[PDB]
Amino acid sequence: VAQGPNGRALAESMNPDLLSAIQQHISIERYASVTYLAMSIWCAERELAGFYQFFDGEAKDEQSHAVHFTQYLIARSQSNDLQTLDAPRQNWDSLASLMATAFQMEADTTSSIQSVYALAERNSDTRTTVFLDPLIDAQIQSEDQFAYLLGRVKFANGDPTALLVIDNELRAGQTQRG
Amino acid sequence: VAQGPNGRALAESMNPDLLSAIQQHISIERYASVTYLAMSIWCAERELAGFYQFFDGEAKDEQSHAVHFTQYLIARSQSNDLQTLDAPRQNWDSLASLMATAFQMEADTTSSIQSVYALAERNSDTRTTVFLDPLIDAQIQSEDQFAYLLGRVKFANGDPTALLVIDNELRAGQTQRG
Amino acid sequence: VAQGPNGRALAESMNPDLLSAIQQHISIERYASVTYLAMSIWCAERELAGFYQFFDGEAKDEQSHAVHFTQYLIARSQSNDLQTLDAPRQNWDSLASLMATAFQMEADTTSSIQSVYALAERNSDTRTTVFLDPLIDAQIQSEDQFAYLLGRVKFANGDPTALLVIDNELRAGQTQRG
Amino acid sequence: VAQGPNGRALAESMNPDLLSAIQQHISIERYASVTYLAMSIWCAERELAGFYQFFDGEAKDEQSHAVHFTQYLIARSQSNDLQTLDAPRQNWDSLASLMATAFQMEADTTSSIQSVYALAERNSDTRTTVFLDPLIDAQIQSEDQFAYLLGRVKFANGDPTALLVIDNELRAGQTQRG
Ligand SMILES: [Cl-]
Ligand SMILES: [Cl-]
Ligand SMILES: [Cl-]
Ligand SMILES: [Cl-]
Ligand SMILES: [Cl-]
Ligand SMILES: [Cl-]
Ligand SMILES: [Cl-]
Ligand SMILES: [Cl-]
Ligand SMILES: [Cl-]
Ligand SMILES: [Cl-]
Ligand SMILES: [Cl-]
Ligand SMILES: [Cl-]
Ligand code: NA
């Protein structure tokens, strides 16, 4: 029985380019997490309490997704390499601009997963594509949700009354089309 | 004991013009159903989640009404003839325009029932007028409900804030005067 | 942030040939639904109450599958296009012939999903293959179920006693090998 | 305040031809009741216990329908006139022949109600047509049920095994398409 790079028994070797891509994706999810924290703070500073609570939860959930990936590398007997984390964006001129960045961040997270997926396919790493399948499904739902929140905020057209109504929706947990 | 056109024992023959009118009405209700599905999609595309949920339920209910009619033809030992279904209207410039089409669709459904009713009276088919009586009563309530939703949306006068408030009413199930 | 063809924020553009294939598949599932409705009526006309109840439920379930696809197009910011629905087949000389058509309809539904799947793979649309994976799994179970019902009816070899026994099985909800 | 023919206060006089038609209809329902009793006995004599239980209940229900009509005449301050009751048919060569007579009896009961209904319409007696409306609706369901039982028995094609299976269905209360 062979030993993998992290010292555990190795079921199947992993291509180093694929390993590097997964470690980079962990950084992307950690960066999404701190970005959602920054967004939660921006909303709290403007008394948008429902948006603050929503993004606080998204920050925690994105970190969990990142840790889920570190557990996969452990399971594959591959080394983890936690990287320097860039500072997030922290300034927006409007809630609509913030929500556009949030949607972009979610789509970019999926794009990173897709790039890992394609590299796994090139290397015939079926464990990795199977591992990623439910995470892509969750990203479809998250993209649908962030398009809903962004579209509702854009519909408000900067009216504070409409934004207070949506803020109260989010505080109540009404965050998707349902 | 005589056999009816669908092969079952026949309690009382039905005039072929009346049979054709009932088969056409089934098509009208099936068309109302797919129209409400189209409306649910239009609302979902604009993040009007409460209207999306309302019309999704109306689509399912209208299909049930259609099947209720197919069961009556079975009970009368008459043949069913499921017809080609036209594609629904799918484009509107405003929610107010959509709700006007929805109200028109409900009134047109009643008008079709009324035309069947009058033909049953001409043929002295008391089973059919009795069968239709509670369906007309339900249509009165549905017309009252759709006039309420259309009138509330028109009262909003295109203000997004007002439309978000009404959208949340519908998501909560507040869909009638009560 | 770009806008998709249905107006919502766009996470990733979709190839128009793939979009057309998904819209066509929605029509296939809607056609399966009305076909199962036609089958439910045919069975009801012959007092096969368990088969009537089974196909009535299959009609409702197939419509739900169709709506599930419309929701995916919404989530991908793609336009829906609800199409004209052909009239279903409505006449069979025997229950065994009906069940053969039902099995064929289920296999043809899977074949349509497979064709969408292959087109998604050609375009590297991993969101769509992930979305389709559980629907293919459900189709495997449905094909297994319809092969069971068709095989049991063929085993009956046209004996009315055997068909009454199977009819009572279906009324009781005994519709699979288990 | 005027007194009606039975001595009670009279809300609205009733045409004597209509009164005679209602008294005759009470006899028809009483005759249906004793006919169903005769059928229950015929089935019991042949150990068709489920059919015996079904027709025993139909006999009791038909008598209740008859009494319902006597209560309407009381409510309209009209005289009741309970008539001589003919002896029922009591001999059949097969269960299929019995079920045909049962279906005919149900259709003939509806026909009698229809004749009362038309006479009420000619006399503009809206109380009577309103009273009859739910009874016609129940007759539609009863005709549907008796067509189901007759059709299932005919499907059996005289096979004792099939008739025992249907007999057990009826004993269990499985008496309609559902
Ligand atoms: Cl900005
Ligand atoms: Cl804004
Ligand atoms: Cl940015
Ligand atoms: Cl318009
Ligand atoms: Cl509007
Ligand atoms: Cl229109
Ligand atoms: Cl055939
Ligand atoms: Cl067969
Ligand atoms: Cl076919
Ligand atoms: Cl006889
Ligand atoms: Cl027989
Ligand atoms: Cl007779
Ligand atoms: Na049995």
mmCIF file of N, CA, C and O and ligand atoms in Angstrom, chain C residues 94-97 153 156-159 163, ligand 8:
data_model
loop_
_atom_site.group_PDB
_atom_site.id
_atom_site.type_symbol
_atom_site.label_atom_id
_atom_site.label_comp_id
_atom_site.label_asym_id
_atom_site.label_seq_id
_atom_site.Cartn_x
_atom_site.Cartn_y
_atom_site.Cartn_z
ATOM 1 N N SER C 94 -56.085 -3.275 -26.460
ATOM 2 C CA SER C 94 -55.918 -4.105 -25.277
ATOM 3 C C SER C 94 -55.096 -3.336 -24.259
ATOM 4 O O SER C 94 -54.339 -2.424 -24.600
ATOM 5 N N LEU C 95 -55.251 -3.727 -22.998
ATOM 6 C CA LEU C 95 -54.402 -3.154 -21.963
ATOM 7 C C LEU C 95 -52.928 -3.433 -22.243
ATOM 8 O O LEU C 95 -52.068 -2.575 -22.005
ATOM 9 N N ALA C 96 -52.611 -4.635 -22.737
ATOM 10 C CA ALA C 96 -51.222 -4.960 -23.052
ATOM 11 C C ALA C 96 -50.655 -4.006 -24.098
ATOM 12 O O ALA C 96 -49.498 -3.580 -23.998
ATOM 13 N N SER C 97 -51.456 -3.656 -25.110
ATOM 14 C CA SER C 97 -51.006 -2.686 -26.103
ATOM 15 C C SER C 97 -50.816 -1.304 -25.485
ATOM 16 O O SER C 97 -49.852 -0.595 -25.807
ATOM 17 N N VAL C 153 -48.731 -7.458 -16.920
ATOM 18 C CA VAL C 153 -49.923 -7.483 -17.761
ATOM 19 C C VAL C 153 -49.766 -8.504 -18.885
ATOM 20 O O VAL C 153 -50.712 -9.225 -19.225
ATOM 21 N N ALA C 156 -50.372 -11.962 -17.627
ATOM 22 C CA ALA C 156 -51.803 -12.235 -17.532
ATOM 23 C C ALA C 156 -52.352 -12.859 -18.804
ATOM 24 O O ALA C 156 -53.360 -13.568 -18.751
ATOM 25 N N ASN C 157 -51.729 -12.572 -19.948
ATOM 26 C CA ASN C 157 -52.105 -13.163 -21.237
ATOM 27 C C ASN C 157 -53.581 -12.931 -21.558
ATOM 28 O O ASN C 157 -54.276 -13.814 -22.067
ATOM 29 N N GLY C 158 -54.064 -11.729 -21.255
ATOM 30 C CA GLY C 158 -55.419 -11.333 -21.584
ATOM 31 C C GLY C 158 -56.514 -11.935 -20.733
ATOM 32 O O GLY C 158 -57.692 -11.746 -21.054
ATOM 33 N N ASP C 159 -56.173 -12.660 -19.674
ATOM 34 C CA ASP C 159 -57.190 -13.230 -18.790
ATOM 35 C C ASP C 159 -57.805 -12.121 -17.947
ATOM 36 O O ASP C 159 -57.069 -11.439 -17.220
ATOM 37 N N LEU C 163 -56.150 -9.685 -14.883
ATOM 38 C CA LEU C 163 -56.107 -8.230 -15.010
ATOM 39 C C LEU C 163 -56.847 -7.539 -13.870
ATOM 40 O O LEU C 163 -56.442 -6.449 -13.450
HETATM 41 CL CL CL E 8 -54.333 -7.374 -22.226
#
